Design an enzyme around this catalytic site. Structure first.
Site, short mmCIF file in Angstrom:
data_model
loop_
_atom_site.label_atom_id
_atom_site.label_comp_id
_atom_site.label_asym_id
_atom_site.label_seq_id
_atom_site.Cartn_x
_atom_site.Cartn_y
_atom_site.Cartn_z
N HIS A 168 0.84 -1.20 0.00
CA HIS A 168 0.00 0.00 0.00
C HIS A 168 0.87 1.26 0.00
N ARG A 443 11.98 -6.57 -8.70
CA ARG A 443 12.05 -5.38 -9.52
C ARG A 443 13.26 -4.55 -9.14
NH1 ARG A 443 7.99 -0.29 -10.66
NH2 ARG A 443 8.44 0.16 -8.45
N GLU A 553 8.56 3.38 -18.93
CA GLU A 553 7.88 4.38 -18.13
C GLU A 553 7.63 5.67 -18.91
OE1 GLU A 553 8.80 4.97 -14.01
OE2 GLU A 553 9.96 3.12 -13.85
N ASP A 590 3.42 6.23 -13.79
CA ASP A 590 4.77 6.67 -14.15
C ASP A 590 4.75 7.54 -15.42
OD1 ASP A 590 6.40 4.80 -12.09
OD2 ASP A 590 4.93 3.51 -13.08
N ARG A 628 0.22 0.29 -11.69
CA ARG A 628 -0.77 1.06 -10.95
C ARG A 628 -1.21 2.29 -11.74
NH1 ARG A 628 0.48 5.83 -8.33
NH2 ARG A 628 -1.40 5.54 -7.03
N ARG A 760 9.36 10.37 -7.31
CA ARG A 760 8.63 9.18 -7.69
C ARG A 760 7.15 9.51 -7.90
NH1 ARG A 760 11.55 4.15 -7.27
NH2 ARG A 760 9.37 3.49 -7.53
#
Ligand SMILES: [Cl-]
Ligand SMILES: [Cl-]
Lengths: 948, 935
Positions: A168, A443, A553, A590, A628, A760
């Site tokens: 989360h 990752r 990305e 991203d 996501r 990020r």
């Protein structure tokens, strides 16, 4: 205590009408709220309660008419609170919002589906109230498309839906609090059984209050910013909550629906229609807390949890399996197993007689499951064991073989019905969850691999792999992967980082392959990144290497992606290593951070188109992994149309999707919610393979290309070109506070000294979610639609045609509209007034104007006058949450001014009855202002859930 | 396949009307029967299925009009079956009956209560449809009896209902089949949810069929007549099924009912309102399979099961108990516990932080529970351990103490509501089940104690304790009990039996006292028996000796009982050992075998009267322990009035009752059924303490005295005086086959060469249950009621007044009437024709006439024209079973003729698609399961 009469009034003013006839949501929320407020009064006094209730009513009046006077009143009350009262108020509103989400889950879970509300087209697939269930989807495929049932069944057997659980972005709520939420939901539900006895109803009410108080009296801070193993233990809660029981239930329902169109078989028990993957403990991208040992730990923990569950389940299976008549093969196995030493069922039988051969084989399997848990626990807790690997299950075939023997044997004797009971459920659980429940993906950044290769090439005096052109990199990587000489040894200067990368590969090599999914390269740009990972995998003696998945990305990475993938397929070594299967990952959030949301959505559609072109050219089975932020990452109904909306043949029977941490509770917390989740994923996948969305008219493509250009120009001109934007972002937004506090395990920036580029995407989204402004989601749409509308009067009509007939566009707009519903520029303005320098106020003002303009334009595009005109159920639930969230916003803003500015003295009010101020002793900030801030962040985060 | 259309019709002809409006019983049974028969057809062919359906249809027609031609048809079909088809038919009807029982339970559990059907007097308490629930019982106590709520609550605090689970007189059904019955019941019930979706209903039907087949396709024989540990494992299933979860539920309901009459308190969580005792592994009376090692095994197994259930239960408690605010005392304990070495929750938390003190202490409790189970397991499998007893819970206080600490602490912080959640349930479970779930009673004949003492006194050259008068026995025993020198050593010549008794005492001594209940002297007659057990207990170094319970069996033993108990109370040593508490056991079935059921009922009423007179004289809390056969041993509703019927002050807040094996599934198999059982025991006890039944009019007592005289004269003149009776009993009844076959673990006689006096009471009842004749239950009532009716015209009015107004009498008659409902003289007549000599046929003929006369007289007494006129629900349920049981009867009788007479060749039919002893055992278990409890 006529206080109740007030909250009812306010609630009904918030949700005026009924979204159906079983619309008991306002009732639910009133009941929960009343019980909670009584508990608040009994624990902290009548004054505290009266204060909290006045705050809630003011907030509800605001979410009603949006009068800024109401915000001034909320603020006036909240600044005059000393830190103790501030903690109790923030905690109070967090818990009240939680209760709202609980009543929401109950309402959704028991809403009767209205068969007369279906319009007949794809729009129905955007809400649970009108979406197609499994059988309705079968009938749609057979009638409209004239597909034969045999084709549907064959499509289903070879289909896989792969749900990937990630940590989360904030408070992955503790497993204990999930348990409490469950008990509350159940109490609520049972209270409304239209047949319940007075004493039953009384005891249920007392149990509900009891559990509301229990949840309120648990701290939600202190201890540690939980270790990655703790976060993983918490993520695995939903397997015990619902998923373990839920998989065999869903699959059996599939069986029934197949029966209801003439299919006599069942879905094969070993067919992987459902799979679960995990990032918890495997994603190390910008997260140094995730170490090699972390990966070893969560792998072993997973093997433990799975063996435990199989152990408990196989005892009920042993009691069921009391037959005696059997296959000759199984009889042989029974006599063979009867030649041995019976410890784990002395409570049940002294020993198992050979007249119960099934029980013999199963008892042995139970023994092997116990030894697997014990050995995994010893490996985790020490590093060695003493449990022989020959006495445990090391691969999934060892486990399946005796069970399949029982199934075959039972069917031989006409006991197929018995075989299709607990035994079939068991086989399906073994096949779906394997020996680990989840498969961990790893990752890492591409730059870390480049660092490692550069240290090697430097150590061999061949030059700097970093300085090499991409073609030279490729050439060297190719010569090495095809070579017979190892690459490096212990005699190698390893930085702490390079040691981390290599040690991670060594851990991967020393663990069973059943434990791992995919190695994912963040910031992939060129074939040399993938080849680099493949080579490191081989030279670290990873026997069964992972599949390598590039995560493209940035926007340029997406345009260059299919060229790169083609070059990778065109390499002989890689082509033979992949064995005709390639998985590529896309990150909606991203790419959004890079170039705005509209441009990233359209570019991702086009990039998937081109990637399928390459995969067909070279004959590889492409699998798109959805990160996501996507349309498919939403909660509930919308997921159905989102999946259906993907470009033709991008799925092809293999859907891999991220289950976002802010959504996993709404999708798996409750039995019905889980079932319907698995259903809409399976149905959406099955349908899309056979019935792709329409191909876009060429003018639609040209229009979206132009809009993407303008939108990227605006987004970048604001976020990256405006010099003072970064100044504003640090003031109007708690991004810095988020980076400093114990909310997420990850650093918010890759390089502390960078601008937005080094930030990020998650803290980027989060920072603007907290102020109810949501800039990362809608910025760029305004100027794009404005542009095309002015360029030709008629382009608006074209946009409206797209929204009504092109699924991809409809779901994109729809998502934007949902995010606007969770937006309130007035609150963003409050943050400006309290936290932003005066000469920067007009900046924010202009931004807010964009916000407003975009909203209107989105509405015009969707053919709506109000936000979410087409989904009044969601409009209702959102409005109900907003009444709690708004108080947490005002509290957050004033708490921020109080933290940053010790020269802002306030006329405090007397403390309000018995404490919570002394649960964070080693705080550098005020006695409970850090805790107050953390509470509002967790709270607003939980109320706003998912945006982009 | 319209064959289903027939069976529905037959069912609807069997029970014509509806016993209510939620009466779906015929529907339930029809569904189960249709699904089952389809399964039978699918496994053994359409020919086999068609045969079985012809058998059931004919059986239903028989239970309709009782035309013996129907029996001729059943027999003609069943004799032509080779042993294979015979086994499949018998198995088939056994399972059909089980399904009948399942629907019967579902109907009972979901029947909506009709509050307008209550008449207002005590008769309402004889059926679950009209009995008083807990709250209705309170309002009864407060309004009519002018008891204050404070008085009600204080009474409840001090009340104990102790239910004693006994081994099954036949097939204690394997835990697996209990579980399958659960799935069938659950599937049936959910299929009738008036809200079910089509796919749910479909998958539910497929699961129903699947489970019917699952249960049918398991063998029920081979292996061993299961070891006492195996029967014990099977008996303990109901704790997992319902009782463990069900007890805290009921107790919470008590709390609620108290609130509704103004009591703000809860029943204390340490109050033992509910208790469970067990005989499984403890009763050795005429049962050599129960050895000392058996007792040690079932003790350790019990402690293991309990430790597991507590262990599993405490993890949810640990998740709930996440509070941080706590007591100063609890905080100290958390920091204390935090100073130590957490292997049993690594899947949950790496460790428990001191910010969660409740979780700290509870995690330690979880640890100690783990070590407790492990130690018990190592002792069972080996004989020693290495798990320190200091690292386990050995007594209940060690276990309760930290939990009570959590409760105190939570209440200190205003978190009492959280405390009354999972924690309160847990405390109430520890107090109810303790460390063992059950407390094992030990039972042995007095004669064995006589043997042991006689070997002792002979070994001391003092003479033979056996030849000694009762007073000399008493005097010596008292001299030793008051003395300080030990009695005997290893130097003692022990027969296998004497070594057995002493070794049993040594095992009791080597086990925690919490594992044991009461030591029970079968065939107790004199104070010297109790004293003998007390001394053997002491001189075997039993540190905390068990309470000794005399079982007065024969009628003379009952008359001499209160004199004896008075004599025991009058002795200082015994008076000081009992500490103001005495428990005596009475055996309704035992006394029945001696002297007929009517005389035993009346003698037991009067004897409990005298025992209470004595117990008040000497100031002891008397507890009457009700053995198998009573009114209070029935299933369901009738228990309520039976308890209410006991003589005033025989209960006094402590009811101990046998849960017969033939009733336990009907009483605890289902969640609702269990709750209502615990409820009616708790409520009936509470009421009887404050509202004793009426005292009998003296003419009633004189009438019963006379009737008992006549009744015993008849019973003894038939059973004991008739010279040919023993021959008849051996032929008209499968008693010899029962004694020789693998049906029960016990020998049927105490001395093989004896008459009926040496025949145990259970095989006595069973033998006549199998032939649907039930002679041990009704014989003697006929001549008694006939006698008093002829002696005076008006005595029938007196009997009817008693039945309408004296609960004891009403419940005695009612039991007899229910047993007659399970009787069919016609089937007894079939057994006569096949298995009994011709010159003995009038004998049987005569007895059957007695049967009929007795029935008529019983009806006249109860004011009925048909049997069970007052309980149509039971009349219906029984009528439904009769159709299956009758087939099992015909099969049994012809199977008996085939077994005993190899000179009876039959024209067998060809075997019917994909060894007579196995058929016989099937029919016995089946008829046993259909008739359940009688007397
Ligand atoms: Cl054993
Ligand atoms: Cl760990």
């Amino acid at each position: 205590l006529e206080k109740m009469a007030s909250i009812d009034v306010h609630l009904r003013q918030l949700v005026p009408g009924k979204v159906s006839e079983d619309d008991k949501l306002v009732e639910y929320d009133a009941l929960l709220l009343d019980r909670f407020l009584d508990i608040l009064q009994d624990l902290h006094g009548e004054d505290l309660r009266e204060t909290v209730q006045e705050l809630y009513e003011h907030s509800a009046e605001y979410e009603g008419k949006h009068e800024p006077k109401k915000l001034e009143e909320l603020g006036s009350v909240l600044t005059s609170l000393d830190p103790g009262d501030s903690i109790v108020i923030a905690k109070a509103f967090s818990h009240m919002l939680n209760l709202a989400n609980l009543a929401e889950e109950v309402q959704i879970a028991y809403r009767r589906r209205i068969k007369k509300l279906k319009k007949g087209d794809f729009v129905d697939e955007s809400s649970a109230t009108t979406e197609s269930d499994l059988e309705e989807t079968f009938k749609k495929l057979v009638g409209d498309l004239n597909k034969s049932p045999e084709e549907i069944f064959d499509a289903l057997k070879n289909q896989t839906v792969d749900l990937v659980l990630t940590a989360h972005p904030t408070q992955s709520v503790r497993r204990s609090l999930l348990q409490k939420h469950g008990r509350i939901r159940d109490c609520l539900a049972q209270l409304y059984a239209k047949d319940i006895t007075p004493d039953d109803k009384q005891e249920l009410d007392e149990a509900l209050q009891r559990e509301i108080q229990a949840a309120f009296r648990t701290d939600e801070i202190k201890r540690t910013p939980p270790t990655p193993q703790d976060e993983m233990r918490a993520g695995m809660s939903y397997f015990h909550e619902t998923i373990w029981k839920g998989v065999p239930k869903f699959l059996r329902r599939v069986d029934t629906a197949l029966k209801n169109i003439g299919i006599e078989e069942r879905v094969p028990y070993n067919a992987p229609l459902i799979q679960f993957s995990s990032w918890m403990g495997g994603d190390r991208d910008g997260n140094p807390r995730v170490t090699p040992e972390v990966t070893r730990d969560v792998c072993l923990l997973a093997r433990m949890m799975a063996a435990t569950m199989y152990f408990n389940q196989i005892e009920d299976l042993m009691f069921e399996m009391s037959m005696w008549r059997c296959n000759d093969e199984l009889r042989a196995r029974a006599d063979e197993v009867h030649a041995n030493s019976a410890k784990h069922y002395i409570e049940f039988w002294k020993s198992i007689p050979t007249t119960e051969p099934y029980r013999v084989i199963l008892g042995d399997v139970r023994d092997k499951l116990y030894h697997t848990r014990e050995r995994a626990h010893q490996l985790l807790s020490n590093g060695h064991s003493d449990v022989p690997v020959e006495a445990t299950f090391i691969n999934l075939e060892q486990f399946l073989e005796p069970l399949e023997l029982c199934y075959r044997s039972l069917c031989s004797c006409g006991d197929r019905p018995i075989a299709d009971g607990s035994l079939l459920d068991f086989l399906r659980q073994v096949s779906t969850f394997g020996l680990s429940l989840v498969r961990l993906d790893i990752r890492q950044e591409s730059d870390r691999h480049t660092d490692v290769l550069d240290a090697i090439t430097t150590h061999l005096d061949i030059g700097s792999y970093r300085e090499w052109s991409e073609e030279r990199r490729q050439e060297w990587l190719l010569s090495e992967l095809s070579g017979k000489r190892p690459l490096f040894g212990s005699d190698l200067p390893k930085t702490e980082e390079i040691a981390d990368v290599l040690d991670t590969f060594h851990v991967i090599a020393e663990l069973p392959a059943d434990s791992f999914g995919a190695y994912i390269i963040s910031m992939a740009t060129a074939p040399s990144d993938v080849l680099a990972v493949e080579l490191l995998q081989r030279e670290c003696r990873v026997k069964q290497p992972l599949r390598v998945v590039p995560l493209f990305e940035k926007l340029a990475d997406l345009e260059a992606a299919p060229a790169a993938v083609a070059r990778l397929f065109s390499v002989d070594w890689y082509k033979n290593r992949i064995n005709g299967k390639q998985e590529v990952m896309i990150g909606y959030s991203d790419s959004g951070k890079d170039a705005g949301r509209l441009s990233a959505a359209w570019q991702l559609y086009k990039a998937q188109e081109e990637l399928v072109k390459v995969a067909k050219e070279y004959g590889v089975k492409l699998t798109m992994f959805h990160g996501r932020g996507g349309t498919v990452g939403r909660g509930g109904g919308p997921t159905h149309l989102a999946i259906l909306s993907q470009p033709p043949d991008t799925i092809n029977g293999s859907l891999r999707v991220t289950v976002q941490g802010e959504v996993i509770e709404q999708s798996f917390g409750e039995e019905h919610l889980c079932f319907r989740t698995l259903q809409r994923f399976t149905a959406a996948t099955l349908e899309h393979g056979m019935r792709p969305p329409i191909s876009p008219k060429p003018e639609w493509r040209a229009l979206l290309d132009e809009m993407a250009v303008v939108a990227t120009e605006e987004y970048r001109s604001v976020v990256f070109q405006e010099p003072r934007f970064v100044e504003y972002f640090r003031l109007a937004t708690p991004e810095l506070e988020y980076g400093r506090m114990n909310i997420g395990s990850r650093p918010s920036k890759r390089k502390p000294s960078g601008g937005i580029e080094s930030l990020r995407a998650i803290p980027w989204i989060f920072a603007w979610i907290q102020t109810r402004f949501h800039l990362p989601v809608w910025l760029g749409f305004g100027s794009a639609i404005r542009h095309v509308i002015e360029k030709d009067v008629r382009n608006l009509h074209m946009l409206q045609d797209m929204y009504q007939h092109w699924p991809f566009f409809r779901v994109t707009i729809d998502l934007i509209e949902m995010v606007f519903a969770k937006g309130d520029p007035g609150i963003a303005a409050l943050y400006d007034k309290l936290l932003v320098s005066e000469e920067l106020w007009p900046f924010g003002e202009k931004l807010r104007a964009n916000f407003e303009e975009t909203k209107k334009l989105i509405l015009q595009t969707a053919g709506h006058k109000d936000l979410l005109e087409g989904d009044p159920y969601l409009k209702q639930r959102l409005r109900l949450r907003d009444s709690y969230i708004t108080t947490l916003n005002v509290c957050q803003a004033y708490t921020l001014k109080r933290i940053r500015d010790p020269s802002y003295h306030v006329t405090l009010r007397p403390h309000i009855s018995k404490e919570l101020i002394e649960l964070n002793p080693t705080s550098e900030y005020a006695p409970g202002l850090e805790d107050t801030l953390i509470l509002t962040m967790k709270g607003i985060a939980a109320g706003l859930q998912n945006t982009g």
